Structures are given as structure tokens and as C-alpha cells.
Amino acid sequence: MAGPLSGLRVVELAGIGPGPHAAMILGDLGADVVRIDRPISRDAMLRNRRIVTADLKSDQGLELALKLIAKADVLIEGYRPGVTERLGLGPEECAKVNDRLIYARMTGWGQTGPRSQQAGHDINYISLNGILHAIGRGDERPVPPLNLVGDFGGGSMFLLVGILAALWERQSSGKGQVVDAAMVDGSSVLIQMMWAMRATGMWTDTRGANMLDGGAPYYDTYECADGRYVAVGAIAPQFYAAMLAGLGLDAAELPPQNDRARWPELRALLTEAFASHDRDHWGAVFANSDACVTPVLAFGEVHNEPHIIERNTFYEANGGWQPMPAPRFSRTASSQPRPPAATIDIEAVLTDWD
Amino acid sequence: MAGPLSGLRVVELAGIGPGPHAAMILGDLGADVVRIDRPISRDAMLRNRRIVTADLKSDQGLELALKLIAKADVLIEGYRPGVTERLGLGPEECAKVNDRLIYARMTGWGQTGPRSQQAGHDINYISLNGILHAIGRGDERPVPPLNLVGDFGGGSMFLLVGILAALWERQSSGKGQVVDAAMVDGSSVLIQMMWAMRATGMWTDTRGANMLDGGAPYYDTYECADGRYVAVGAIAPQFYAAMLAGLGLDAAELPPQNDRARWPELRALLTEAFASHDRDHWGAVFANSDACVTPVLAFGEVHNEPHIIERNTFYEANGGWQPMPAPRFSRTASSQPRPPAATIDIEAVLTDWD
């Protein structure tokens, strides 16, 4: 298995959403991941795994699980706190068979506290820490940024960081430990730039009136003639200049870039400009420039974009496309992910692992 | 320095946005981070660092930088590809003095390909790979989800994974290597669940019409009597049921949960319900159940929410709050972050590095 984590052994206890994403990226990077499910998946997410089944509530399944865990470097669970405890797969039971184990707990609310037993989803976790409030336009109610901020950016990615960090630690203490990965905490650190900016006046709690939330005419999308969109990210003065130059707008006749009072005016002039031609016309105009103007591609157009083609950001599977592994490593490169295969036998895996 | 990365040594070449966030998280977990800037910061982001100064264009600063790197585990750089190269700090130069270095390159577009020398910001990277199109309501142009998805979720957090993965690979090879972390690749993997779902009919390219983008009346925010919001995440039938009960709605009077054809009706009835009382009324109704209904708090309210208080998700600083370290480690815990203190002389750090 190619990648920098070639050699690492991960048990994943089948759950939903953030946990399997973390397991995926470990497999993507060469880890040997073995997912235990309840008694062929067409879910690309379950790439780079072997799947086995066990009934964790039977003595026999309990015992099989504990033997896999005994040979593994990592365990990923995403159940309510107290669930593995009650199954006999809690941290203390695991430690008795494998004190080198990195026991990784993926939750929304974390291991303890008033909401720790309560159900929730991404939207709930980012609702509670200021993130969801800060998304969207001032004249509309907060829109969920899918589940990219709670589940993934501030969920699985923090689990991953904790897992790999605790592996580095183990390299000098010889022991593992428990990683408590709560989406409510991970997403907060994810948005630390904004908490920093609050204290210096570089960000306000008012919706849709900041530099990065759609409040700024140079940091937004614009609708073009064909009803399709471009994205403008032209923050530096020299990027802004380049963007006005492509539009054929005379800076002398426009409000200054950072005269907020005149941002309505600026936006309206930018709107009328971008609306005068189709999306793809602006890709030609701004070609090779620092204007920070890009087409906004729908998923089904992505695989035709040259920079995406040239770098192999996606690979073909099933319906269509899935993202290749990230990030990239110069010497131990990942290979194209392996599909979900049929189930396999658990004793088989033990015997492979010895 | 407390945490699992105690002992790790990181040189950070000063730049913007994703790279400093990666350096932060390493510092938060115990690393020894030393940021080289140009000739006290009040940027909470620069917490858990020592700042040194050098002119890398000058024989003397290049040589001082090279001596630091010589002693480090990890280098972070966020410039245009080709910049360290021409400065004398390219991967091949660093390898000459330290072949165990993890050389970690944080870009938007990546090291090679047609856009790799073009300026860009978060909004641009996620414009190109389908993510930004997928954000927001069907009747509004795509709204940026701040810079959570490209700069951090798919940016710094992948740089981190790459760094720590490479450190693991280095334990058996005895060598480092280069990590090419491009926001356009990391964000794609971040959104892999959607690319999975496209192939199984569980996600459409149509904006504002999916389970997680605000298309579903049970996964969205609603305006309350006071003009504030709640978030509803009630996907599972039993969660939905609890939500209807807290609203005092009779299930039999409503359309089925997943009759999409009557989702306008279902939304209107939910709209009317939530509008009848103020956010904090619903925050109380829904405080304990599995209804998946949470108040949408603004940042300035967060620190008063019981669950946030009890788990110490934030700490005081510079007249505001900042997020504590994430994730959490049961044995080598992180401490409260150290502020950005004054500069330090670079020879003094070299000395300290035995």
C-alpha cells in the first residue's frame, strides 16, 4: 500500500460521517484500515478499506474485535460517549490488550458536558459556536455550508491531526492515549482567524458585512450574462487593479476600493460589468493574470478544467469522479484509491496481521 | 511545552492565512515553532510561537535561516512555487543540510500546472472544483463560506496531515520529503462525501436542492419571533419526531417528512411554528431532547452557552475569546496558548537548539 502511512494499522468501528472520512484519508495515504460493520459497497467513501463484520454485543464478536484491536495502532469510534464503554470496547478495556493504541473518539459535543449525550448534526455544532451565524447574506437567514465545517474541516480533520500527533508522541513515550475530537472544538479552532480578527476590529458579528463573507465587492461571486457565475478574490490593491483592467473599468471613475460607504456603488458597477458577458468570456479575459477572477464550475464541469486535468485532482470511478489523495508526497506517493471490495473474513485478517 | 508534539521543531517562513494556521496548531499541540519574519504582534493567530527576523535575500539571513532549518523537523512555506528555490531555500538546498526535513508547501493551485503561478484566494480555489457552486440558496448567487473550506478545512488542515504523516514515514526511512498541499486538492477530498453521493443519486448539482445545502426543511435555519435564528438538523425519523413534538405539531397534520413534493408546505408550517416564539424560547424547549434544534448564537454570545463554558472550548485574550487547542489528548494535554510575545534574536534560538 503506497503512501507515507504504509505500515500503519487502523481499526474503524462503522459509524456515520466524520469517522469514516478520517479512516478514508488514512487509507488514502497508505494505511491498512479494517472497518468492522454490523452483520460490495457503492460508497466511494469506503475506499481503501477491508470490511469485516462482527456482532459487538456477542461474546464472540467482542472477542474478535479485541484481537484486531490488539494488533492495531489506531482505533476510530464515533458513537455516543459511553457506547464503546458498555460494549467492553472502552479505552480501559482496549488498554489492557494494547497500551500502544491511539484511541480516537469522533463526536460533535465531545466526551463530557451538558450536551454530550444529545443527538446532533453538523448544523447544530456550528450553530453553537458562532460559525453558522457568520455564513451568508445579511438579507437572508444563515445558510449551512453543507457539512464541510463541522463534520469535515473541524471534525474528521482534527481527528486525523490528533491521531497522527499521538503517533509522534508514542515514538518517544512508547504508549498511546485517547484523542477526544469534538466538532464544536475543532470547528472553533478552524475559525480561529475570525476570533483573532474580532479583537482587532478586522471582523464584526454583523452578517454579510465583512471582508470574507460576501460583504466586500471584491470578495464575492457575480452573475454573468449566461446566468452562470464568476468568483472575485481580488484583495491586494494590485489584484484589484488587474481585475478593473480586465473589465475595462477606469479606476479614476470608481469609488476607491476600500471606501466602504461607497461599496453599494462599487458593487453595482462591478455587477453591470460582469453581467455584460458570459462566465467563460471572463476566463479568457483574465487569462494568466493576478486579477483573482475564476469561473465558478458546477461539479459536473470540474473534470474538464485544464488545471484540474493536468494535476490529476480526480480519478474516474462508478458514476464518475472522486478526488485523488491529498496532500501529495514527493518520495512515498499515494496511488489511485482501491474500491470497496466484498466483505472479508475477520480470522483471515488476524492471520494476515499474525 | 505541553502536548503530544512536545519536541517537534518547526521553522515557519512568514506568510498569510493557511500556513500560519498550520504552524499554530503544531504550536498548540506542543511543537517548538519559530517564525522567520522580515525586518509584539496582537494577532492571536500568532500564538505559541517565537518570532525571529531575517532578510532571506541577503547572504547573512539566508545563512542564518539555513542554520535554523538544519536543526528543524519541519519547514512551512506558503509562497508562489519557485520562490524559496530562487531564494536559495528550495527543497534541494535544504536537503543538502538536512535530509530529515519535512518540507511543506502550502499553495492554492499546487506546485505545478497551468494556474500554479497565478494569484488567488480561498474563493478562487473552491470556485474551480465545484464547492463554491454548491453553497447557498437556489435564488441567490453562490455565497463564500468565509475562507473555512479552502484556506483551513482543505488547506492548513491537509498541510498538517501531510506533515504528521511524513514524520511517521520518516521513522522507518530516516528521511523526510516534500509535501505539496494544494487547497484545490485538499478541499476536494474535504468534500469527497458529496462526490460519492453524486454517483448514487444522493446529491445533485442543482443549487439549494439537496439534503445538506438547505434544500430540506429539516436541515436548515429558521427565523424566530425576535429576528434571531435556530438550526434544525433533524434527519433521522426519531429526531424529526422529537422536533415536531417540541413545536407542539401533530405529525398527522403535516406532510410526510420526506415527501419532497410537499416540502414547500412542510417548510411553511415549520416557518410559522418557529416564528411564533423567540430563539431563546426554542433554545429552552430543545435544550435536552434529540430534536436536533439549537439556537444560532453570534460569536459575542458563545462564551455564555452552558456547554461551551463547561468544556472550556475558549479562553480569554486581548479583550476577546480565542479557541483552546483541539483536539484533546487524555495523557499529554495541551496548555492554554502562549501569546505572541516580543521578537527574539535568531542566534539565541540557534544556541538554545543545543
Author numbering:
A (entry chain B), B (entry chain A): 1 to 39, 45 to 359
Please give sentences taken from the publication describing this entry.
α-Methylacyl-CoA racemase in M. tuberculosis (MCR) has an essential role in fatty acid metabolism and cholesterol utilization, contributing to the bacterium’s survival and persistence. It catalyses the racemization of α-methyl-branched fatty acyl-CoAs, converting the (2S)-epimer to a near racemic mixture of the (2R)- and (2S)-epimers. The enzyme enables the conversion of α-methyl-branched fatty acids derived from cholesterol metabolism into forms that can be utilized by M. tuberculosis for growth and persistence within the host, a key component of M. tuberculosis pathogenesis. Within each active site, the large domain contributes the catalytic residues H126 (part of α-helix 3) and D156 (part of α-helix 5), while the small domain contributes a third catalytic residue, E241 (part of α-helix 9).
Crystals of the three MCR mutants H126A, D156A and E241A were obtained using identical conditions to those used with the wild-type enzyme and diffracted to 2.45, 1.64 and 1.85 Å resolutions, respectively. The overall structures for these single mutants were very similar to those of the wild-type structure, with small root-mean-squared deviation (RMSD) differences of 0.38, 0.37 and 0.38 Å for 693 Cα atoms of the H126A, D156A and E241A mutant structures being observed, respectively. The three mutants collectively had fewer hydrogen bond interactions; within the H126A, D156A and E241A mutants, 3, 5 and 5 interactions were observed, respectively. The active site of the E241A mutant stands out, as the relative positions of the active-site residues D156 and H126 are identical to the wild-type. These two active-site residues remain parallel to each other, and part of the PEG molecule is nestled in between them; consequently, most of the associated hydrogen bond interactions are retained. Within this mutant, the H126 residue is hydrogen-bonded to the peptide nitrogen atom of A241 through a water molecule, and due to this interaction, the movement of H126 gets restricted and it does not pivot away like E241 within the H126A mutant. This important structural water molecule within the E241A mutant active site resides where the functional group of the E241 side-chain was. However, the introduction of this structural water molecule does not replace all the hydrogen bonds lost in the active site. The rate-against-amount of enzyme plots show the expected enzyme-dependent increase in rate, while the specific activities calculated for wild-type, H126A, D156A and E241A were 46.4, 3.2, 18.5 and 12.2 µmol.min−1.mg−1. No significant change outside the enzymatic active site was observed in the three mutants, establishing that the diminution of catalytic activity is mainly attributable to disruption of the catalytic apparatus involving key hydrogen bonding and water-mediated interactions.
